[PDB]
């Protein structure tokens, strides 16, 4: 009784320290209000707002349906480890929430 949030297992942070991975979910026809949060930056994707993490400059996100292509930039080595993606579908009521097993982001 929750949505099937799918992260990738281990993620290899990039040259300048920018990790990118897709966070997919399964009952994904509730697309109007869709807040996505990152736990070890968060934004709410609607129609008025289409590229998120405006208030979280270290993060980049592009929504389409059952996949969210994600980007955390500026990651140090002192940050490596467990990264989690939470998919809230605030509309229609009633909410329909989910969380993923996490991502080991190893910041070489």
């Amino acid at each position, epitope marked *: 009784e929750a949505i099937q949030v799918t992260q990738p297992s281990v993620v290899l942070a990039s040259s300048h320290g920018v990790a990118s991975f897709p966070c997919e979910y399964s*009952p994904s026809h509730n697309t109007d209000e869709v807040r996505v949060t990152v736990l070890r930056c968060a934004t709410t994707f609607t*129609e008025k*707002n289409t590229v998120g993490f405006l208030d979280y400059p270290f993060c980049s996100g592009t929504f389409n349906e059952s996949r969210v292509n994600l980007t955390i930039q500026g990651l140090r080595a002192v940050d490596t480890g467990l990264y989690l993606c939470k998919v809230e579908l605030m509309y229609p009521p009633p909410y329909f929430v989910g969380m993923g097993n996490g991502t080991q982001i190893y910041v070489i």
Partner: antibody
Amino acid sequence: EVQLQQSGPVLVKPGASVKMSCKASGYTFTDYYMNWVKQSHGKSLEWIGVINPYNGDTSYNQKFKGKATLTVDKSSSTAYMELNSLTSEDSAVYYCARYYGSWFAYWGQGTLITVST
Amino acid sequence: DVLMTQTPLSLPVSLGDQASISCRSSQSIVHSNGNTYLEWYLQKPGQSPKLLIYKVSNRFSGVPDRFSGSGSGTDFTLKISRVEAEDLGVYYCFQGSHVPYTFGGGTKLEIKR
């Protein structure tokens, strides 16, 4: 394509209870939410509530919170609404209708509940 | 609770003219996410309702191009341009923004021949 099949008409004596069905076909019953809409003989429509079949969550129209109890059953692709303390003003046409970018985008043919002595 | 009051209640219109219905909401219909959730349903006689316009001005698949929505805040308008015999019935606006979700009273569109 999508088809919603509701139970037939039920004559229930007052004070009893009735539970009706909506049998989803041509789509994935758990994928989209589901509403029940009441249409008295006085023509105008009313929203009772919505239930997430994948889950069982509901959001109810506070003025129905006690009169109606909506419930789903994933193995049958069938939703259920149940009405306690059936009165005379509880007699209406009851509709199931499934979300799709819009609240009532697919409609059931309707269950006519007559509450007589 | 948000009241939806339509006008007219009856509305005779000859095939080929332009019918136009008005829905007025007690309080704004714009939701917090920024979307605005007005819907236009048409109940042909002895049929269940059928969806016509969602999110104010959007035509659900199948609805002819004669049908159109417009509005913002507390005032909205469905307008059939060039009416046809197939269009007779009752036309309901419905808001799905604020709980509880309510309907308008309806607008019986009659044909004149």
